[PDB]
Design a protein around this ligand. Structure first.
Ligand SMILES: *Cc1c(COP(=O)(O)O)cnc(C)c1O
Ligand SMILES: *Cc1c(COP(=O)(O)O)cnc(C)c1O
Ligand SMILES: *Cc1c(COP(=O)(O)O)cnc(C)c1O
Ligand SMILES: *Cc1c(COP(=O)(O)O)cnc(C)c1O
Lengths: 403, 353, 403, 353
């Protein structure tokens, strides 16, 4: 399967259609009366001409059909293409990808060094299930600064062997971020004190694969819930892990032991979603930007947690600028008027829906010091922006802002 | 005023969404484009009728008229020039002479060279027919090529907007479907006949179409812009003789003026003529590595074919040459790949030609 | 694709798995770490041994996958195998199969000679849509006797050219039947008076393909709603037409003109249903027999319309005995006590469901001379028996019989 | 008393149906057999524990124990003879000596030669363990081979009945699933861990399994009777040395007596030894035209394989020979084809051997 056409290098959007294409064709007999069906493809122009000599009825009578049933291995290769990674493994869910990854690298006595906050399933996974297997966890709250990461890392090194550094960036809600390259420098030091480099696993669900590539900034694994945004549908549940071949091979071996792979039908559906990923992501992201501009300078908005509007001089702005190529579709704002106004705003929405991709959503993460440190107040509204028309989203936001 | 892309996020439910995208009052779904066409015709025609129609039509539609309807005592009269009211008028008079004109069946733009017909003109010709025979024919417009994003024929005089959704809306080779859109009462008549002859779209396909509609705006826009980029590249290529692409019609021609008033975009499908005849065409085709050799795969992947030796090989030469289908003509149907990959493929294949 | 293994001839149940099997395999690369997946098949034992040399990890590294995506042509060939027909065409529905069939053979001026009663969609198709294209219809009420068929046929020959004889046997409800061979003799005479033999199309939905094969008794086409019983699921809608190759080819040509073919996904689902057809049909039929024995001699049952219990000496019994190999799963009985008792019985059922395959169903066809001639009284209950345990069905029937 | 076949006509809904078929109080669905197994183990074991288990286990389960659980500080002790309480007892004592015995993991009958284990015996050994250590291990029985139709291990002392539904219940190569069945409170613990590690069965597969359950009784019965017919044919065939098929155990053996009390049928999978060693085995395999060469395709199609050179090639020879896996051993997994076609295929392939 080609990554080049002569000297020209193929882009990902092309590759979601072409990479492994030959392996998606089936053959059937040509039987009269001959009609062109929705699936027929021809190896050569002369083959097409011969087929239509039957269709025309000029001649009395093999034909290829292109269907969309890629193996898991081919959908993995396409993911890896999008990421710019060597290799990929698919999983039945985001949580099974994370769990299998942790099971492949940790042992009782170990410490998982991680960022904060993390997806709630990941926190409960570390706090209960891994704690019960003798695995400890130490958090760094501030992932922007190499110094705060270094500190937590000493705290971890004193509880035991650091076998994994687990980060999520940006994290939900409010998009605090971690400096992946700083995490990698700190892993090189950890390794000096202990004789092994921990595996750096980055939950890239929020911005990946289009707007952030953690493997290009020092991560060893880029991990996903493909359920959330890539898949584009609530009935498509999947996770993935991507990185270098030998590291991914170790997760695959664990994946086969514990049986966490993605089933073939879901692989087919994912192959179909990938076809429109670049379109869906780019629209979501442009929609989020237009909405962000509208909320900024809106009388009823206290604060916007939107990374492109961080101050030029801040460390956050500098990091975002070197680690990311876009802001994705998820962000938060604090409304003027606390809870009762936030609820009234929510209750008024007619286009954005209330829940917890594709469709635009609004939620209230609060529903005390922990929540405020994150920037989750009772005035806080989290928006996850889909692919509706931006004008229509903005209209709905204006009127709900009960204004 | 909500945009349709916003509103996309049962047969009955999907029909309602399609009606919203079209801006129509109601919609009926069918197992295929051809079944939508047939069911529509059988709802409206009876032995002794005449179907007046534009030219060229899709080949399945031609067969349907020439064979099946002809056997049921329904004749057909073509107009080759649907741009001018006067040529549409001449045809209608031939048709009135042969029987009751119950349907006017048009297809615009037409595959594979984007011939067009003036839907408002056809409507006026229909209102003359009504004056001269007592009843106004149903105007059905096969809007597959640009619809529903880039043309709304119900806004320009059609009574029904008819689709193969297989081609572009659905997105994939395994999703086949047809639709008929218009006023509840004209549509209701099509559904009754649907119920009788069992031409409904199956539920799973209705579900799959539902899903497809969510990305329809994005995919159509992208295919359209990929197509414009490719047409622009080809227009300057020294192995390309002629383009059949409506945005490139001279701003002063009647075609240009009609395109500007009836359409908001060119869609994904067009043709060009290569230098060096059929043998050059065939070498170009055989060197393609990204565009596949095919007629349709649902609209997501880009395809190339040779209409004179393939789809239009059974069409008489007078029709072919009138619409610009020559031995050097290549049809392209552009999907949503990166435009640079498509252009690089085209450029290397043109070097083989 | 094989119909024989050496000299041994393959049975249909085998063929639903094997016929076109090679065309259902896909190929993928063998990539480490190697695991056996749910889909792998091996061309040879040495190939299997080599694959597991990877799986065992003895060696570091092509493999075939068997999925179930048959072309429509292959599912058609499998149907034809079950029928003992040369050829088959698939359609989007039972009604599209019937309509396409009629459209392929009739023209304004023609008469459709048919049996009675017919499925309601077929009656409305003949009474409205074909009447409006100048096509007339003449019925024979008694399809057992060559004489009553002959009479209607004269009545038809006097209205115009008889191009189709359309029969449904057994018909719903009450399982009146038509003598297909008698219909064929009458078609040979029609042909003598007019110079063409009409096409004999037999709606075989009730007993086909296992318990009746109309093509073996003089029919030219065996036509189906595969929705009702073959498919085994309400979301699987399909029809078919089967017979000799040249006759089926004419229906296919019409099918391509009017676009009434069955879509690929439904073809796949049908391919899956066929795998269990022989099992489902044989259970349904044995269940119906056990239930029939129970209702017969049940105090509260007036009359049973069950073909195996027709009197030995009757023409009906003789016909059934030479035309059918079983009774299928659908029949009727008249309860003692008219409407109010029939309703009470229905309302009491807990296992059989009230509606209009796979699951057992009960309905009231009445809900006056037309209905009685058929043997649809207000006491009449129609049962369509599914694949539940016979003991459980009988239990539910006993108690509902409000007894 | 309703039969389960009657009651088959959300994850939650399908779980309830499976629980009815098993006769269990509750069920949890998983993405695979292996994920059902893993999730169960991780719900119950902690570092310092010992998993006592029967032998042979499925190869994925062996790996899971030998690698993953061993790395998490959980050791494992096997008993080779699960027919006799005394050998199960000896093993349990070895296990108590190494740590807390938290699970007893059994698999009966075992693939590919139908070794069996006495589930009531294991339960008594568990109650002795409880007396000697303070807590009674969870008994999990991998019932894939006969369940749920032909064995109910929860009726004979197991705490949990664990399945690869991929193998026989689901019916097809594209339906992979696992299950854990038992009391609501033991199951509830497995679901909590399921929620945490994300091992749930996807909705579409839950839907597909739903459908499969409707024909489960018919397909299992048919496979079982096809298998009995084939075993009967093979038993008299002059190129067949030995059968590994539980109905053919001597009515006086302990195996026979245990089979009669714990099982209601033999299911579809068994083995036989061919005369002429591996080279004859391989020629037999390569001549098959109806049975395919494979390990599993979901249970509908009949398959043949060579365990010593394929699935059990990594298993040490002492285990292999104890369970009767020899170079001459052929595994058959019988589907729902007509028995005459299968026997005709077997007979012609045996002539090549
Ligand atoms: C949802 C989510 C997960 C877990 O994904 P599932 O597919 O639902 O198991 C992990 N990480 C992040 C950031 C998430 O949003
Ligand atoms: C393909 C096509 C049809 C027929 O649609 P099907 O879905 O293939 O039956 C009708 N009209 C036009 C213009 C087409 O391109
Ligand atoms: C239902 C039925 C039909 C029509 O079938 P559809 O698949 O529902 O279009 C035709 N004949 C008979 C006997 C029927 O029961
Ligand atoms: C296949 C199998 C497993 C594993 O099931 P998967 O669904 O393939 O993960 C477990 N136990 C037994 C006995 C098996 O045969």
């Amino acid at each position: 399967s080609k990554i080049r056409l002569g000297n020209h290098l193929l882009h990902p959007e092309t590759q979601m259609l072409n990479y492994g294409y030959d392996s998606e064709l089936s053959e059937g007999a040509v039987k009269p009366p001959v009609f062109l069906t929705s699936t027929f493809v021809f190896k050569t122009a002369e083959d097409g001409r011969d087929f239509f000599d039957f269709v025309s009825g000029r001649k009395e009578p093999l034909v290829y059909s292109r269907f969309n049933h890629p193996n898991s291995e081919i959908v993995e290769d396409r993911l890896a293409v999008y990421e710019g990674a060597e290799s990929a493994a698919l999983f039945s869910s985001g949580m099974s990808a994370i769990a299998t990854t942790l099971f492949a690298f940790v042992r009782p006595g170990d410490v998982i060094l991680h960022s904060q906050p993390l997806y709630g399933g990941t926190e409960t996974l570390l706090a209960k299930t891994f704690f019960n297997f003798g695995v400890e966890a130490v958090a760094f709250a501030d992932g922007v600064h190499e110094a705060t990461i270094e500190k937590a890392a000493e705290e971890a090194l004193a509880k035991g062997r650091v076998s994994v550094i687990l980060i999520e960036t940006p994290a939900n809600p409010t998009n605090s971020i971690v400096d992946v390259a700083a995490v990698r420098r700190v892993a090189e030091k950890i390794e000096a004190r202990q004789g092994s480099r921990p595996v750096i696993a980055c939950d890239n669900t929020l911005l990946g694969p289009v707007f952030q590539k953690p493997l290009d900034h020092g991560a060893d694994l880029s991990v996903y819930s493909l359920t959330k945004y890539v898949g584009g549908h609530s009935d498509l549940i999947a996770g993935a892990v991507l990185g270098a071949k030998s590291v991914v091979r170790q997760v695959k071996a664990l994946r086969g032991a514990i049986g966490t792979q993605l089933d073939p039908h879901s692989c087919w559906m994912l192959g179909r979603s990938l076809e429109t990923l670049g379109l869906r992501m780019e629209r979501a992201d442009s929609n989020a930007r237009a909405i962000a501009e509208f909320l900024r300078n809106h009388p009823k908005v206290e604060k916007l947690h939107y990374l492109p509007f961080a101050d030029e001089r801040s460390d956050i702005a500098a990091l975002f600028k070197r680690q990311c190529t876009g802001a994705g579709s998820t962000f938060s704002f604090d409304i003027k008027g606390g809870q009762a106004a936030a609820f009234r705003f929510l209750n008024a929405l007619q286009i954005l829906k209330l829940a917890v991709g594709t469709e635009s959503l609004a939620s209230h993460p609060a529903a005390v010091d922990v929540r405020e440190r994150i920037g989750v107040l009772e005035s806080t509204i989290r928006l996850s922006i889909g692919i509706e028309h931006p004008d229509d989203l903005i209209a709905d936001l204006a009127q709900a802002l009960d204004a």
